[PDB]
Design a protein around this ligand. Structure first.
Ligand SMILES: CC(=O)N[C@H]1[C@H]([C@H](O)[C@H](O)CO)O[C@@](OC[C@H]2O[C@@H](O[C@H]3[C@H](O)[C@@H](O)[C@H](O)O[C@@H]3CO)[C@H](O)[C@@H](O)[C@H]2O)(C(=O)O)C[C@@H]1O
Lengths: 285, 237, 49, 99, 38, 237, 237, 285, 38
């Protein structure tokens, strides 16, 4: 039943129906199939050549957006006496709700990830320094630097990108790097051979670590530096759509839920209340 | 014609005289692992009839205040029959599943059960940041129950659960639901004791009710693995 | 009218479903109003530790 | 997917996903109504079509509502479901809705 | 794409094939136009 | 196969799962006025969907002592929807009718209704020489009731009323009756406010009965004009 | 030859023996909505003669100090005849318009009226920041009058209003103006009760004058909808 | 009568005329048609091969100009104690008169809109910071951020453009996004089913909201930041030209008028006065 | 245009077709050169 759809389907004119043994409007929800009643069979229709496009809902476009996945502020200064001029971030797409919810509309996803890094500075006035930063990709669980001036930043094999605050945001693509044919947006299991591991966390789905430091030595005064990382999935393939998240997220480590204090989206009632089932909200007066 | 059905696998057979057609998850059918998708290089064992047969789990009672039940696969069967033995002696397994949920009552009873097969149903815990523990997830043959079926115990919703392979058992219409499940995973095979591909959920969206004589109305689940394959033979765990 | 015998429940339920037909089209993507946050989710900061 | 038609105070969890109808004593009784903006909060918001549509701003196309009766086999009845194009107040009598 | 690795290429927004039936009609027996489903 | 039926006209549709085939009065079907039978020379208006659709009248309650009900056409619809408007703004009208009478109960209920379409049903008054008055005949949407159904309120008999287009609603068998009526008159068109071509009569020949829970058993009438045409446009009456 | 004209639509006809040719707005002619431009999928009703006919509104008196008159379409006709009924029972409407403005006097009278059809004539209020209210815009059959015709009551000018479809009624030359209007909108159909496609404006640029016997000199407007179509049937508003 | 015109029409030589029944200079304005008298018929003409081009008056060029549509100044500082480092603007082409008047020369318009954003800074001296700004497109009526540091800026689906003050003005194209085949420059109606809505305002013609914030945290001192937005319509199609606006504009919400205190452009007299109809202004002495 | 969406393209200043008559002579009956309009 696979076919190429580029526009919404057309409508054909229909006439009066009075056929015994034919009841297109009746269905059996129990079969699990969605009703197949066509407009032409429910009412009398006219012919309509529908030219409405369907490209903006292509999965590639739906998920094809650079969404914020990480925001980190730290102090750039003399740390003689906390993120000391650098930080390490275990990449994940569970911290910011907008991206998280969209990705979670699918069970499995295969995509390459375009990473964009935006840097901002503020004095703690005599001007803003045009600093050089280094973002080093370190595999999940692998050895990360522990100091701004660590020799580990020599990045002999790890990929590192050096960029200035005055340059456009840095950008690079991390390929689909899962050990499987697709990432598991959801994982009903324990990724360990013992029974004490974390539930729902399959490290195979953790792209990796992003170690970011300011290359410049500290200045005589302190600054607040904020690094924002954006991710845009591309060359996407998606499988098994899922029920959208309704309850507010509680943790990046699980699907735990509590609900809002009052509707909407309270554990007790997802939709806001109306006086009764015969009360029409926004009724035209 | 699409109300009667007989399922026969191995030495087991099941008939229903009030079916509602039957569901083939995502329009697929189970099959053995082809050479162009294989990873493990050892010759697999394909037991066929000793494992690809119906296993009936203990029944549950549908009560006026029931919230719903669930069984995870292959966990629910990892300790049953020859399927269980192969699972215990092999590091890797692969298979589809033929699911048949049964529930009959009276022409004076009403109630509607959503019978849905959820892929990767990762449960969430309620009102806490602590993730669910091993014993909260691995229930085995007994299966578990829903705490908040309204949100599928995962913060989403049962209202949109129809996006997953499913059928319904509406007492006035049918007395059974059948769903054929193909292998569903991102890997060609997996370790059966730590990951569940599918979760069978049976939830009463419309409660059981009647004004006739009260009787215990059970719900029974029969599951038949399909096209079983096992790799990585060793001792039993 | 809904008509039932003495032993059937005299109150019955309907379940309503809705879906789009294949003549549907959606345009102009925007952030969904159905999800939001005002703080960091639990564990988010730990990703930096 | 299921519409949350019974989104009323006193209806909790799944009770909100089903509309109960009873044997009536009067004729032509109104049983319930449903607001139709798939872009606003209401019975249609938390549905597959509602949720995805809300990631967009413009929409076009036909919608289909299917109702499954879940009473007992011995129960019978006839209902009339009406869609009223916009323009005025929601009809409150069958003789008006029927048009 | 001037890069040597194909995964570096721009987006691929040309896949217009669909098959809703895998979600809308996953029933083994095809349902007819106006004939009783049961 | 001949027990289920769907009728669709304009923006309206009706289904029944317990029909008894359906009747086409005198084996005919509605049609527009052909040029070789026309009289009025002004170009007619043929509204189609705005008038050729189902109009559901207020229901009536079937009681143990009911004598029967009747609705005259087009009177019953002369003030309903766009059909009513066209009727009021035009001196002449013409149309057929698709009639669907509905009545459901329980498998423990019994009763039989004669559903008959009577052409030119000229009522008679009982025990008086004075002819029926305007208000005795023109009841509109509400319809009227039979005083002496035994003689069809016209001195003849209900026993031989089967000579007219009809069906029955025998509760153990079906829950609806359908009759298609063609234009029936000696003239190609007529003034809708003073003459009724057809009279729909619903009479309980076998009273409603049961020993199960008493419930209000309504009888509902839905009527769809067919192939409507109007001539002689002016202001509304 | 181009001074005499007869317009015939439905059961109505109009003749003039002193016309000035006639205007077809933007060189177009009314037509029904083609399938390749349609949006609403329900089968439309096309009443033809019951709606596509001349409707004559109440006349107005041309006085020495008159500032001008205006009528918005379809508002001016939304409550007249069958056109009005269809408009009230349907959410959507579509149509063109044949406009005929009439004004005769004497060979001793002088005066010149600009008869212009303005698309989307959005009125402005004078000396205030508050936008015009509903009752300032929706006048219906009565129409309204200009406060400052010099700027077309919208801050622009009547001097350049000739950019819109129009004609003039210069008493020494002609006694009528005729303008054919096609559907004018950015949508194939619209809700008739909240939006007016066209505004008919009749403004005396040269005042009425004479030295002969004074008589009441009326100005009459007759409007005939053309190719009417209606969709989205429901109850009347 | 449609044809391709690339130059002004040529003139043909004409001779003496003395024809009975032929009066090209006489016309009937009452028909509504513009005079069709040709120069060749009014006077004796010579032949002229006219090469004057007509391309600068093409609608595409006439409206094809980046016109200022929004100018907003706000204070960038610590707002502990007003636009707090960000602002929201409901896009409209009614605030600046030059663009407004040209667009209003037409009834309907279909065009794609090229948006250019220019940013300027001034200290409230130690130098001007090269700040990073974020302009997020939010559909008309949709959810806009309420704080500079709101999580709503994660822009998971909304389009956002990040730019520096030191970069060239930011630029992007908003497609013709109306739900209709063209924008209604004028709307003689009420866009609501009740009677209390605003007259002449069809939200279908409101492109959307532009939410702009400074991404950098505040500095120790305050600055005045001004954001100017320009719009250039392109791929234009126009319908039904209209009488040009003469009275000064009063509001962006309507066509209300008052006129200047004295001519020109006073409600009472659009053109400035001259002593009499026989007085020649600027007469050559 | 190196962008994938055609609406991103530069201006289109090549449409030289005109039809003034829809504004200058919208009369149903064509007017002749020097013949009386009435
Ligand atoms: C993340 C989340 O919970 N999103 C829901 C959203 C938010 O809860 C609100 O925006 C929080 O302010 O609500 C949604 O439903 C709309 C609600 O509207 C409430 O009344 C509003 C009214 O609609 C507004 O026009 C008015 O200005 O303010 C009123 C409140 O004072 C209702 O009371 C409530 O029950 C909802 O219906 C939404 O669509 O924005 C649903 C989101 O999922």
């Amino acid at each position: 039943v696979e076919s190429i759809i580029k526009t919404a389907t057309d409508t054909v004119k229909s006439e009066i129906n009075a056929e015994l043994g034919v009841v297109p409007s009746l269905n059996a929800v129990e079969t699990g199939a969605t009703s197949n009643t066509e407009p032409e069979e429910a009412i009398q229709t006219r012919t309509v050549i529908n030219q409405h496009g369907v490209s903006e809902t292509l999965v590639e476009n739906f998920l094809g957006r650079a969404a914020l996945v990480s925001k980190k502020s730290f102090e750039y200064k003399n740390h003689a006496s906390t993120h000391k001029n650098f930080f390490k971030w275990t990449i994940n797409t569970k911290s910011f709700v907008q991206l998280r919810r969209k990705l979670e509309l699918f069970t499995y996803l295969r995509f390459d990830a375009e990473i964009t890094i935006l840097t901002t500075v503020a004095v703690n006035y005599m001007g803003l320094p045009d600093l050089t930063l280094q973002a080093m990709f370190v595999p999940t669980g692998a050895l990360t630097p522990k100091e701004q001036d660590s020799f580990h930043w020599q990045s002999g094999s790890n990929a590192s990108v050096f960029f200035k605050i005055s340059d456009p945001p840095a950008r690079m693509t991390i390929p689909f790097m899962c050990i499987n044919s697709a990432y598991s947006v959801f994982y009903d299991g324990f990724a360990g051979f013992e029974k004490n591991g974390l539930y729902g966390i399959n490290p195979a789905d953790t792209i990796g670590n992003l170690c970011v430091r300011i290359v410049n030595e500290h200045q005589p005064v302190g600054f607040t530096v904020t690094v924002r990382v954006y991710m845009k999935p591309k060359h996407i393939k998606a499988w098994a759509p899922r029920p959208p998240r309704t309850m507010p997220y509680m943790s990046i480590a699980n699907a735990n839920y509590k609900g809002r204090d009052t509707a909407p989206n309270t554990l007790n009632a997802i939709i806001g209340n109306r006086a009764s089932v015969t009360t029409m909200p926004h009724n035209i007066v | 014609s699409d109300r009667v059905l007989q399922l026969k696998l191995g030495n087991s057979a099941i008939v229903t005289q009030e079916a509602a057609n039957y569901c083939c998850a995502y329009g697929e059918w189970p099959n053995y692992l082809p050479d162009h998708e294989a990873v493990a290089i050892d010759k697999p064992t394909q037991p066929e009839t000793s494992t690809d047969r119906f296993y009936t789990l203990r029944s549950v009672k549908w009560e006026s205040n029931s919230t719903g039940w669930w069984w995870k696969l292959p966990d629910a069967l990892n300790n049953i029959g020859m399927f269980g033995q192969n699972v215990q002696y092999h590091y890797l397994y692969r298979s589809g599943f033929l699911i048949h949920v049964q529930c009959n009552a009276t022409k004076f009873h009403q109630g509607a059960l959503l019978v849905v097969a959820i892929p990767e149903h990762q449960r969430g815990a309620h009102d806490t940041t602590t993730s669910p523990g091993f014993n909260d997830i691995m229930k085995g043959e007994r299966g578990g129950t829903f705490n908040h079926p309204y949100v599928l115990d995962d913060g989403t919703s049962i209202a949109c659960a129809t996006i997953f392979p499913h059928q319904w058992i509406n007492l006035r219409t049918n007395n059974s639901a059948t769903i054929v499940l193909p292998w569903m995973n991102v890997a060609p095979m997996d370790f059966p004791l730590r990951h569940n591909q599918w979760t069978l959920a049976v939830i009463p969206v419309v409660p059981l009710g009647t004004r006739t004589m009260s009787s215990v109305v059970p719900i029974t689940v029969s599951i038949a693995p399909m096209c079983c394959e096992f790799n990585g033979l060793r001792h039993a765990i | 009218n809904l008509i039932v015998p003495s032993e059937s429940s005299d109150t019955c339920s309907l379940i309503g479903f809705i879906a789009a037909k294949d003549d549907f089209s959606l345009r102009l993507m925007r952030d969904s109003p159905d999800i939001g946050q005002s703080n960091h989710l639990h564990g988010a900061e730990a990703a930096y530790q | 997917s299921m519409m949350e038609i019974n989104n009323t105070d006193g209806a909790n969890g799944m009770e909100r996903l089903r509309v109960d109808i009873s044997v009536q004593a009067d004729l032509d009784q109104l049983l319930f109504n449903i607001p139709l903006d798939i872009q606003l909060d209401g019975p249609l918001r938390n549905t597959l079509v509602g949720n995805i549509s809300r990631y967009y701003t413009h929409w076009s196309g036909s919608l289909e509502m299917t109702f499954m009766f879940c009473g007992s086999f011995m129960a019978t009845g006839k209902l009339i479901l009406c869609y009223t194009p916009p323009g005025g107040s929601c009809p409150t009598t069958r003789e008006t809705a029927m048009l | 794409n001037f890069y040597k690795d194909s995964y570096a290429a721009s987006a691929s927004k040309q896949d217009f094939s669909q098959d809703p039936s895998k979600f809308t009609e996953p029933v083994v027996e095809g349902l007819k136009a106006g004939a009783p489903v049961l």
